[PDB]
Amino acid sequence: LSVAGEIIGLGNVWRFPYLCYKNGGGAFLIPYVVFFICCGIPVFFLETALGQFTSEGGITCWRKVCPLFEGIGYATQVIEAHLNVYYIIILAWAIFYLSNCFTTELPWATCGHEWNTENCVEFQKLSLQNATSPVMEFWEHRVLAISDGIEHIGNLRWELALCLLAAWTICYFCIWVTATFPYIMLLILLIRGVTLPGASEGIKFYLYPDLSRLSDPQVWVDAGTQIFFSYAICLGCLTALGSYNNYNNNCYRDCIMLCCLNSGTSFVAGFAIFSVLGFMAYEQGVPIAEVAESGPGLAFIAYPKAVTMMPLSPLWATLFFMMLIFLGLDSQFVCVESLVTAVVDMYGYRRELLILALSVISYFLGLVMLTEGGMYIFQLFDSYAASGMCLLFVAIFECICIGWVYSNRFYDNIEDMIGYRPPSLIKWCWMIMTPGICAGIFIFFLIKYKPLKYNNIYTYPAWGYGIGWLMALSSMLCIPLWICITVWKTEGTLPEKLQKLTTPSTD
Numbered sequence: 135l136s137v138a139g140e141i142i143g144l145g146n147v148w149r150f151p152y153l154c155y156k157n158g159g160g161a162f163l164i165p166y167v168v169f170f171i172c173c174g175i176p177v178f179f180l181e182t183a184l185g186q187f188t189s190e191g192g193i194t195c196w197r198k199v200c201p202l203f204e205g206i207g208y209a210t211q212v213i214e215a216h217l218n219v220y221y222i223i224i225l226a227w228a229i230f231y232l233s234n235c236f237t238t239e240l241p242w243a244t245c246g247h248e249w250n251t252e253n254c255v256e257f258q259k260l261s262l263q264n265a266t267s268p269v270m271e272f273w274e275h276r277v278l279a280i281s282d283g284i285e286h287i288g289n290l291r292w293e294l295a296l297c298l299l300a301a302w303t304i305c306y307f308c309i310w311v312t313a314t315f316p317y318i319m320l321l322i323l324l325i326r327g328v329t330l331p332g333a334s335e336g337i338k339f340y341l342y343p344d345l346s347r348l349s350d351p352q353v354w355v356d357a358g359t360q361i362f363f364s365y366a367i368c369l370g371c372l373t374a375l376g377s378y379n380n381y382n383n384n385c386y387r388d389c390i391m392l393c394c395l396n397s398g399t400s401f402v403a404g405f406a407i408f409s410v411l412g413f414m415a416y417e418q419g420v421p422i423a424e425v426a427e428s429g430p431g432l433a434f435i436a437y438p439k440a441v442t443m444m445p446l447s448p449l450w451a452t453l454f455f456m457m458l459i460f461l462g463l464d465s466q467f468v469c470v471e472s473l474v475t476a477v478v479d480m481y482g483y484r485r486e487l488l489i490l491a492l493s494v495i496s497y498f499l500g501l502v503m504l505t506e507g508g509m510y511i512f513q514l515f516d517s518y519a520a521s522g523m524c525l526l527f528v529a530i531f532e533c534i535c536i537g538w539v540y541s542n543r544f545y546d547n548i549e550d551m552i553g554y555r556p557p558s559l560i561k562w563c564w565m566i567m568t569p570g571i572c573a574g575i576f577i578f579f580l581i582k583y584k585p586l587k588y589n590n591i592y593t594y595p596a597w598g599y600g601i602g603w604l605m606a607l608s609s610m611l612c613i614p615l616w617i618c619i620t621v622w623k624t625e626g627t628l629p630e631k632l633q634k635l636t637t638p639s640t641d
């Protein structure tokens with residue numbers, strides 16, 4: 135039995151270093167631990183066991199167990215669709231970067247190009263105020279012509295538009311040895327990172343928590359929700375992951391590797407990246423902060439520099455973007471296949487040709503993020519939709535059902551499935567810990583919050599936060615509303631009616 139490169143993906147190589155550097159330093163690692171043992175493994179285990187016992191995923195599995203709580207599935211399908219639209223945008227930039235890599239001299243290493251301004255200094259070749267770097271000018275002026283403000287959307291970058299079209303075609307065909315390659319590249323990047331001048335200075339910024347700043351709830355809601363973005367929890371795919379098992383699989387001991395090892399790659403990625411930020415500081419005499427960007431560009435401003443600071447730069451630059459593209463496509467294939475499970479809901483009745491309709495709709499809708507100033511709407515797509523509060527609230531209801539509306543009986547089913555009984559701490563976690571911690575964090579965020587800013591300079595207008603609230607509600611308001619559809623369509627008498635909607639089916 136083996137799983138190869140399953141845990142490794144874009145969820146810990148691109149997102150985790152982004153969030154760790156933005157919110158702060160090593161202080162972010164404390165909420166990443168308390169949200170891991172408690173609000174982590176128990177939910178993953180619950181989802182996997184529920185998907186394995188019922189032998190079905192999506193929404194019908196939640197129809198069988200607590201038919202009243204059928205709206206959970208609809209919430210997980212909408213958020214998956216929201217993720218599918220923008221997750222492919224990241225793969226467009228990698229295609230563009232790989233496209234102009236087949237050359238003797240890398241374009242993101244020298245000064246004097248048309249897009250470059252007069253303030254660039256070609257460092258490492260023989261401080262100075264108002265100075266920038268050539269690497270950042272290949273991100274802020276060439277791939278994405280950033281426009282001041284969200285009001286001005288400007289024109290559309292046609293070069294990036296074609297790259298997105300390729301990504302869709304490559305995978306519209308996906309749905310008509312290897313898998314060890316990413317680890318080698320990660321090791322190579324890590325080796326070239328720690329053995330650099332000033333590397334140890336950056337590490338202390340990463341492994342020394344800065345307390346007294348935990349009062350801000352932003353550090354507390356990004357952590358935990360990042361864990362939920364990883365592990366693929368609350369995305370409506372884990373409930374189908376266990377459907378392929380053989381009903382006699384040791385589910386508890388099964389994830390203990392995946393339940394833990396997937397968090398063992400984020401630490402190594404942080405080691406590899408945060409060591410580079412110390413180098414750029416030792417080269418420009420600047421704080422460990424302000425060397426790069428706090429938004430979703432760090433993975434495209436830190437790696438290309440490390441690759442440049444290495445012999446045979448083009449050859450290694452070609453392969454890194456290849457592994458990024460491969461991981462992104464592999465992650466997108468599964469997330470696009472599950473949404474087409476709408477067949478079970480509508481009994482595409484027989485033939486699933488709606489994949490073509492989904493791709494065309496998703497392509498045209500996603501063209502907004504590729505226009506001038508498209509990153510500004512990207513943050514609103516990543517801090518409120520498919521992240522932030524959209525997952526915490528769903529998880530509070532994820533299953534107080536298994537905890538209160540179904541615990542002891544489920545443990546009997548688990549013992550029947552695997553043979554023995556898991557420790558009783560998980561049951562108490564389900565009962566009181568996860569729905570308690572998540573509710574506390576939710577109330578903390580809603581009682582005292584700070585407006586979100588793009589890399590801590592630019593603040594969105596009122597309508598940006600309005601659209602963020604709209605897109606966040608569009609996934610969390612389905613569960614309370616769906617009870618009004620289920621109840622009030624049955625007999626009607628509340629006491630007698632509540633009983634039927636709660637009795638599970640004949641599993």
Ligand SMILES: COc1ccc(C(OCCN2CCC[C@H](C(=O)O)C2)(c2ccc(OC)cc2)c2ccc(OC)cc2)cc1
Nearest residue numbers: 140142143144145365366371374375392396461464465468
């Ligand atoms: C890169 O290649 C893959 C990596 C993980 C997966 C799984 O989720 C994919 C969901 N995506 C959410 C945002 C980005 C995450 C990331 O890219 O990391 C993952 C997966 C899901 C459903 C499956 O059956 C239908 C099978 C696998 C996954 C998730 C967690 C896990 O254990 C922690 C193992 C597999 C699949 C391919």
Ligand SMILES: [Cl-]
Nearest residue numbers: 146361364400
């Ligand atoms: Cl993570």
